[PDB]
Amino acid sequence: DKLNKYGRPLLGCTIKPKLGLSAKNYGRAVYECLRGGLDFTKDDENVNSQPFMRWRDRFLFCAEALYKAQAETGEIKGHYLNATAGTCEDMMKRAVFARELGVPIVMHDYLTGGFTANTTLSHYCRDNGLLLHIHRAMHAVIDRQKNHGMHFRVLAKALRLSGGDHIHSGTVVGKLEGERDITLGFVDLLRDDYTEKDRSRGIYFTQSWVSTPGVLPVASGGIHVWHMPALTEIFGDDSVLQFGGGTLGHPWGNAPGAVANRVALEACVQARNEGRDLAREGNTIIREATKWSPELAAACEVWKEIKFEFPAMDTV
Amino acid sequence: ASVGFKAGVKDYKLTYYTPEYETLDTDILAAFRVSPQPGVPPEEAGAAVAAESSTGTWTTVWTDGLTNLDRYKGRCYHIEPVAGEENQYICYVAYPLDLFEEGSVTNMFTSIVGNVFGFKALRALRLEDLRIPVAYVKTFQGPPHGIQVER
Amino acid sequence: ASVGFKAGVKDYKLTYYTPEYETLDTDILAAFRVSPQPGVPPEEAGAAVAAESSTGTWTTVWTDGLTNLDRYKGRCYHIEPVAGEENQYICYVAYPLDLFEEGSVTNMFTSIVGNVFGFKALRALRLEDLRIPVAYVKTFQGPPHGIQVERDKLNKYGRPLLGCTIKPKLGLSAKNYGRAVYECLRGGLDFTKDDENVNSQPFMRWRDRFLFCAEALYKAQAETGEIKGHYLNATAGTCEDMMKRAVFARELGVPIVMHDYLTGGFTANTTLSHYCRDNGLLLHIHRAMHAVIDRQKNHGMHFRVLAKALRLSGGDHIHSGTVVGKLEGERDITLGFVDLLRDDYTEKDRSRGIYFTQSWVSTPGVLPVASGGIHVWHMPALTEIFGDDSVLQFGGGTLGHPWGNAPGAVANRVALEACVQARNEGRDLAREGNTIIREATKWSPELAAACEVWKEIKFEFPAMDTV
Amino acid sequence: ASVGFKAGVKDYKLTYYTPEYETLDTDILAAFRVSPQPGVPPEEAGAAVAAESSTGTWTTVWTDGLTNLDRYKGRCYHIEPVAGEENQYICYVAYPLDLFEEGSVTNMFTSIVGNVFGFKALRALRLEDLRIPVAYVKTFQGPPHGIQVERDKLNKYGRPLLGCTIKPKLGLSAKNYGRAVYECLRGGLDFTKDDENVNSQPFMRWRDRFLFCAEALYKAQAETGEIKGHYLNATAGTCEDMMKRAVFARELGVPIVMHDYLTGGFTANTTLSHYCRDNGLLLHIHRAMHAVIDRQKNHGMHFRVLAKALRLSGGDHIHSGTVVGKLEGERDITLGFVDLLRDDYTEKDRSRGIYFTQSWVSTPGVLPVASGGIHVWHMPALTEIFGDDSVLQFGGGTLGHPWGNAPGAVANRVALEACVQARNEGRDLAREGNTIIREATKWSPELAAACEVWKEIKFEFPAMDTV
Amino acid sequence: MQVWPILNLKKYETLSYLPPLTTDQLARQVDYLLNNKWVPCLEFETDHGFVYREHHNSPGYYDGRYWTMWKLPMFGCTDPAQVLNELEECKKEYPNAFIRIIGFDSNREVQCISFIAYKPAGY
Amino acid sequence: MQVWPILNLKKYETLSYLPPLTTDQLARQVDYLLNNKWVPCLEFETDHGFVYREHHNSPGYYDGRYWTMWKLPMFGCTDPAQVLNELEECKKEYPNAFIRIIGFDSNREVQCISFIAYKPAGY
C-alpha cells in the first residue's frame, strides 16, 4: 500500500563486490540498477561502515541516486540502508539519518546484531514509518545439519515476533541450501494467519498468529533469468526476488541487467495469469520473451547452463 | 591494467585460492574445517568460502574494475588435509583489515560467518579459530574492568 | 626478581639507554635532535629525554618495583651524530604502546613533548619525526572525509581547487564580507574563506557573517552552475561556542567549516572533527601559530610532526605552505610532508627529512593548501610542486586585481586551467611556465591585467629550516 | 576621502610604521624581539609584523576602502635596538580593541602570533610581553577561584601549600596509585597529584583511578584532621571526554581537578574553567609543552605571555618553575612573572623582563607551583623566593625517601614549618638556610634521613633565557 | 551493447515493461481477476500521472498514489464484458486521463491486481 | 576595466574557462587519460545539466551530480580512437544532451579526469 506495488513479486538487487566500492561508486551502481526496472537495490549484509566507505557518505549518495531513478521512471524506488552496527547507539544513529533523508527502507542482520537490538529497531521503524528488511546472516551455522541445531522455521517464527517486514528465506534453486517442501512450509508460517500441522513439510504444530502481520519472504542467492519461472511458481506474488550477480553480471551493465530481470518476471506473471503452466512452459515463456527483448536475450546467453544441484543436508 | 570485463561464471579458485600469499600482520586469519560435497575439490571449496565471505559473488560483475580487488579480497592461502578423515580439510583464509568496521564484533561475524555455511557445494563447515590482529584489537574496549581491577 | 630498593640519584643511562633494543611494531618511535650542555654526554642526554617523557624521575623511587618497568619505560636505542655540527646528535627513542590513551593526540604530545625541552642539562632540543604504529593509528577517526570523498561531494576532478581569503583581515562588516564573497565566487574560484582571525568581533559578529555569506555563496552557485563553498570559521573561546557556530553552519546547509587547530587546541579540534564526520561538513584546518614552534632548526618540533598529529585528530584540508610565497617552506622538505599528508605509505627518506617509514592503514588523506603571497605567475610552479590534489589560495592575489574580485577570480581560474591543459598535453611546466601564462594573456584580458601588476614580485630569502 | 585604488605591492612601512602614534588605554600592546634578514630594515620588518597580524596583506586590495583602516590597523609605533646584539630590535606594536573577540584567548593569539613568525624576511621573532588593557580583561572570567578563595575553602593559611606527584609517571595500577596517595597524605602533605601524562591508559583507566584516589584521600583526611586533596586529571582527547571526567570528580565531592592547558588547548581550557567556577572545583594547571615554545631567547614566546593568557582563560594554580631545580628558570625573570600571576598591578620593569605596566581590575590571582627536582635542602630557598602564596611539590622528593611515603611527607612538612617559624622569627633564610634545616634534623628522624640522601644534589647550568 | 533510454520512458508498474496489451490480452487479465473472485474497479487521473512529493517528505509518504474512483467497485460482477464496458465508457468521458483496473481481495484487503489500461496520447 | 558577464555564463568545471577545445586538443586529453592508465567512460544528461537542490538541503547533498552512463567503462581500452568513436555515437543518439568524458583510477577509486566534451546548442 505504501509503495503502490501490486500484482507481482518485488524485484531487488545487491550491489557488488560485497566490500570495496567507494560511496560515490555505490550510488552510481544504484542509480543504474533502479532506472532499469528493479524496485530495490541494497547494501550487502556486511556493508556497515568501513575504511573504504563510511556509512553516512553511503546513505547520502544512495539517496541522491534513488531519487534520480524514481524521477526518471515514475515508480517508487527504495534502497535498503544497513543500520547493523556495533552498539545500540550506533544502530539508532543510522536509522535516524535514514528517517531524515525520507527514504522508505532500512535493513538489519538480526542474528549477528541480536534479538535485543532487533526488537529496538523494529519498534523504532513502526514509530517512524520505515520498512525493515531482515538478513539471516549466520543462520546456517545453526540450522544446516539435521542432527544438531535449530531449524530455520523456529528462527523464522522468532523474527515474525521480534519484527521485520522482509526476511531472507532461500531460493531452493540457487547457490545455498533450501529444499522445496520444507521451504514452502516455513514460507507459510511467515505469511499466513494460520498454518495447520503437517509433518510432510516439517510443521510439527498448528500455529495461529492472531492477526500479527505477515512477513515478505526474500529469495536471493545465485539466481538468474532462467530461474524466474520456478521462483514465481514456488513463491507467488508475495515475495521479493533479488539478483545481485544476476544484474551486475549482465554483459551490458546495470540498467540493461535490470530490464532483463523485470521483463523476464512480467513475462512469467502474464503467462501464469493467462493460464500457462510455469512448471512446464517455463523455458518457452523466457525464450519467447527473448524475441522482443534484446536485453533479456543477452542475459539468457550468459547463464543458459548455470544450475546448482547437490544433495541436501536438511530433509524432512 | 583494467583487463577487460567478460560476463559469465568462472571458478572461484582462479581469484581466491592464493597458496603463495604471505599473511600480513594486520590480516584477520581464519581456520575453517571444510567437508566438500563429492566432486568439489578442496581448492574450490576453500576458494568459495573465501570468496563469499569477503568480496565475490557467483558470476563475474563489471564493478570489480572500479576498485583494486587484490587489496580487498579474502583469500584461501593454505589447505591441510585432516588426519584420519576422508574428504575433510582445514582451509586457512586471510581477510584484509579494511573489511571490518572498527569495534564491531557484529560486523566481523557477518562477513566471516554470514553465508558460507549454507553453500550447496559443502556438506559441513566449522570455524575453528581466528587470529585477531593487534591493530584490530585496539579498536575495542574489551572487558569493562578485567581480572586485576575486579580483585 | 625484586632487586632491592636503594634511595639516591643515579644516571639515567643505567636504565634508559638501551642500544641493543629491537623496536616493536607497536612502539611509537621518536627522532630528537639533541644539543647537550658541555659536560653532559650524548647517552645521558638521550637517556634523560627518554626517561622524563615516559616513566622516570630524578631520583630512585620504590614504587618502580610494584610494576614491570622493563615493559613501560621509554628507551634511547640509537644515537647518531649530526654531520657538520659539533655536539649535536639525533637520538632515537621508542615508547611502548601502553603509554598512550587511544585516540588522544593531546596525550601523545603530553608525554613525548611535555617536559624534556626544558631540562637544564640540554641547550636545545627538536623533535624531527614520529613513527606512529598502525595499531595506534586505528584508534583515531582521522579526517572527517578526506580527498576522495571531498572531490566526490563537490563534483570536482582533474585540477587543483582554487580558493581566496577575503581582505582586509579584520574590519569589514558582515554585508561587505558577503559582497566580496559573491564577486570572487562568480568569477570561477571554488571557495572563499574567513581569514584565520575572523571569529566574532565588534565590527562583524559571527552569525551575521554566516548568514550573509550563505546568501552570497548560493547566488554565485546559481549563476555559474558549479558547486561553491565558503569556509565559515568556528574557532572560538570555549567548546560550547565552537559547537554553536558549527551547528548554524549545518542549519544553513553549507559544505565547509574551518578551525585553527593549534590556537584552538587538539582537544577542541578532535570534538569538531567528530562533529563534522557526523554531520557531513568538510573541515578546513589553519596552522596559525605553527612557526612559533617549527621555524628554527635547533629547537622546537618540525611541521611534519604537527601535520601527522592533524591527520590523526582530523581535518580535510591543512595549510602546508607555498615554497615560492611570502612565508618559509623549502621544496624538498615540503614535498616530504605533503606525501605524509596524502599517501597511505611513505618510506624513510632522509633527503626529505623523513626519518621513519609511515603507514596509515587507510586513514583518508588530507588535502594540502598552498596560501600566502602567491599570484598568477606562480601558477605553473604551484601546479608542478603540488599536483592535482591541493587547494591553491589567493587572497591579495584576487582582491588586489585592478578590475575587482570577479575579474580577479577569472584571472586565477584561467591561469590554472592553462597550466593543467599544458601539463596534460606534455609540456614542461618548469621550463615553459612563463610561456604558458604569456600565451594565455593573449586571449584573457583578465589574466593580462593581473600579469602586468605582479610581473616583478618574487620572495627569495635564505631558509632557516633545511634538511 | 577615498583616495583612489592602485593595484600593486608597496612597502608595509608606508601604512604600518607609525612612530608618532600615542597608544590608547584600550589598545593591546606587544613587544616583539625582531631579527631581520640582511637587507630588510627594522621599520619594514616591524611594519610587516604589525601588518599581517592585523589587517593587511602582501599587495594592495581595493576593499580597504570600504572601511576605515586607520581605526583597525595594528601599528609599529616604536623600535628600540637591542644592546649588544647586532641586527636585533624590540619593535612595539599596538592593536586596537575592536580586533579581538571578547573572552577568547584563542582569538588573541591567532592574530598576534598566527603567521608573523614564519615570514621569509625575518630570521627569528620572539614575543616578549603583552599589555592587556583593562577593558579587555573584564571580558574574561579569570581564575575559577583564586588565592583568597582557595585558602578559605581549604582552611589553609600562613605557609606555602605542600604537594607530591605519584611516581613512576606511568605504569602503576589504580589500587597502587591510591595506596601511594593515602601514605603521602597522611604524612602531612596537603595534596598529591596525577602526573601530567596520566589520563586513561591500558594500565590504569581513569574512572578506576578517580575512585581509588577518593577512598585514599578521605582516609588520610580522617586520620589527620586536615583537609586533603588529590588533583584528578581531566585532560582528554575530546571536550566530551574532558567533561565526563570533571563530572565524576564533582560527583565524588573532591576539591580539585587538573588540566594540561597547552596540550589540551585554550578552547578546552576555558570550557573547564567555566565548569569549575560553576561547580566549586579548584583547577590546577600544567604547562606541559611550554619549553618547546619559550626556552630560546631568539625565537618563540616568553613564558610571561603564556602565564598572562592562563590567568585570563582560567586556572587556580599554574606551574611556574623552581629556579633551583632540574628545569630552567632564572630568579629575576621568574619573580617577574610570579608577580604578574598573583598581583593586581605590576609596574614596568625591564630588569625582570616586564615590558609593560599591567593592571588586572581584580581578576583573582593564580597560585604559582614550584615543582621539579627539588628536595628538603631547597626548602629555605623556595620559601624565600616564593613566599607563603605558592604550592611546593615534591615527587621524587617524597617517594624517594628511604622509609617510604608517609615518612617522606613528614620530612617535607617538617622542613617547611621549620623555615616558616625561622623566617617569622626574624632569621635570614638566605644565610641561615642550612642551619635551620640542620637544626631540625636534631628532633626529626624523618627529616634527618632525607637530608642524608640528597645532601649533594644541586642542578647548576648556564641559563638559555636571560633578561 | 544497447544503452537503456533516458527520455520519455515513464513506466506504470505491473505489465508496463511488456509490449502493449492487445485487447485479447487485456481481456485475459480481467478473466484472471474474476476467476480469482476479486472485485474489479477502475481508477482514473488527469493531473498527476506519477508519484511526487509536495506535502511531506517523511518516510513512506508520497503524493499521487490515490487516483479517482470511476463509479464504484463492481461487487458481484462475473462477466468480463461488464468490466471492459466500463473501460470504454470511462475512456470516452476522460480521453485525457490515465485509467487503470484494480482488483480487491476483500479477505486480505489487499489489491491483488493493478495495471494501466489506457494512456493519453503523448504517452 | 571590463565587467564580468552575468547572463548565459554557466560553466562546466575543468577546462571550461579556456577557449573551446579543437578536436586535436580533445584527442590530447584522452591520450593523457590513457597514458596514465585510467579507465575512460562517457556520461550524458538531457534534463538537469546543472547541480540543484530538490530533495534535501543538508550539508554535502546536491541533486544533479549523477549523470547517466553511456554503455560501460571501457576497461582495457588503449586506443583514443575507440573513445572518440563512442563520443560520436553518443552525440548522434543524444544530440540534445551534455556529454562528458571521465577517467577512473581504480587504485584510488577517484575520477582523475572529467571534462565536458559536447554541449547542446543554445549552450
Ligand SMILES: O=P(O)(O)OC[C@@H](O)[C@H](O)C(O)(O)COP(=O)(O)O
Ligand atoms: O538469502 P540467504 O540464503 O540468507 O543468503 C544470503 C545471500 O542472499 C547473500 O546476500 C548474497 O550476497 O550472497 C546474495 O548475492 P547474489 O545475489 O549476487 O547471489
Ligand SMILES: O=P(O)(O)OC[C@@H](O)[C@H](O)C(O)(O)COP(=O)(O)O
Ligand atoms: O598558509 P600558512 O603558511 O599557514 O600561512 C597563512 C596565510 O596563508 C594566511 O592565511 C594569509 O592570510 O596571510 C594569506 O593571505 P594572502 O592570500 O592574501 O597571502
Ligand SMILES: O=P(O)(O)OC[C@@H](O)[C@H](O)C(O)(O)COP(=O)(O)O
Ligand atoms: O613544573 P614544570 O616546570 O612545568 O615541570 C614539570 C615537572 O614539574 C613535572 O611535573 C615532573 O613530573 O617532572 C615533576 O616531578 P618530580 O617532582 O618528581 O620532580
